[PDB]
Design a protein around this ligand. Structure first.
Ligand code: MN
Ligand code: MN
Length: 315
């Protein structure tokens, strides 16, 4: 084995750079190293609140990405466009790191790598595809069993259980993968109290955060996904007012342009997987926010070449 190794059992910036090059060339990280990252990140994640609260001072910025879905070569393109993660270049990745794309293992161990290297500046939120049900159908379990073993897969499942469910910047912007709630009156305190180390239930606040979608019309509708609901602008407005927030950012739905701003400004979608599943032809984006001005600035990008492995080859 001539590949990437931890230094004194710990991630460093040169390990991350070597890892990204090894994966680019389609090589595999030794299982003992993969194991080391997974157990260390479980310990870092298990300490966090379900709601991560982050303060952006006035000269500080942060980058919010949406779904990446195993599109490793597009993940690399984000860091090329926008810079590597660092204490002065923080990132939030908003769920759905794995499934569908056939480089899910590469995406997730690079993200967990960076989370270990920059724990206060590199943030991962749980999406609905960081769950067993989804992984078993949409490729990630298949992929892990192929590259490692069922054991390694069970360890990834347990680490996903500790991913925080939402993030709040400056008590003003709330970020979550899916969206808002199927009942009125949920508060930031309620989110903070969710016991999140589990597979999500069929219903309730934890389920809604991962699974819900905005709709243009007022009210709530039964979801076309069969779980949670669609929520109208009136739901968003009431939630923002009670919680003293400006707007939300969520991901979870593919967008032709890479983003959407719904509910008159209040409900922004960001989606970071360009030409999704090699068929959608969509653009992707990420968002820049800054401490002196939290209004979203959208950056669009398109797909780069990747090796000839098809989407869901492992499902
Ligand atoms: Mn998704
Ligand atoms: Mn999703």
């Amino acid at each position: 084995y001539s590949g990437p190794k931890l230094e004194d059992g710990k991630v460093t910036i040169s390990f991350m750079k070597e890892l990204m090059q090894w994966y680019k060339d389609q090589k595999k990280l030794h299982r003992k190293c993969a194991y080391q990252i997974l157990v260390q990140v479980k310990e870092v994640l298990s300490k966090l609140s379900t709601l991560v609260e982050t303060t952006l001072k006035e000269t500080e910025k942060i980058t919010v990405c949406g779904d990446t879905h195993g599109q490793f070569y597009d993940l690399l393109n984000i860091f090329e466009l926008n810079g590597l993660p660092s204490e002065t270049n923080p990132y939030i990745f908003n769920g759905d790191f794995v499934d569908r794309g056939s480089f899910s293992v590469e995406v997730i161990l690079t993200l967990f790598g960076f989370k270990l290297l920059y724990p206060d500046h590199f943030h991962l939120l749980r999406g609905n595809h960081e769950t067993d049900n989804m992984n078993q159908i949409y490729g990630f379990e298949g992929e892990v069993k192929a590259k490692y073993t069922a054991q390694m897969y069970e360890l990834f499942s347990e680490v996903f259980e500790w991913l925080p469910l939402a993030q709040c910047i400056n008590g003003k912007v709330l970020i979550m993968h899916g969206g808002l709630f199927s009942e009125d009156g949920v508060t930031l305190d309620d989110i903070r109290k969710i016991e999140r180390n589990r597979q999500p239930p069929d219903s309730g606040p934890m389920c809604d955060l991962l699974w819900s979608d905005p709709q243009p019309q007022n009210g709530r509708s039964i979801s076309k996904r069969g779980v949670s609901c669609q929520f109208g602008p009136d739901v968003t407005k009431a939630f923002l007012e009670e919680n003293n927030l400006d707007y939300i950012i969520r991901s979870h739905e593919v967008k032709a342009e890479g983003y959407e701003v719904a509910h008159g400004g209040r409900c922004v979608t960001v989606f970071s997987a360009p030409n999704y599943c090699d068929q959608m032809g969509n653009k992707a984006s990420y968002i820049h926010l800054q401490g002196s001005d939290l209004r979203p600035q959208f950056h669009q990008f398109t797909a780069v070449p990747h090796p000839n492995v098809k989407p869901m080859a492992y499902a």
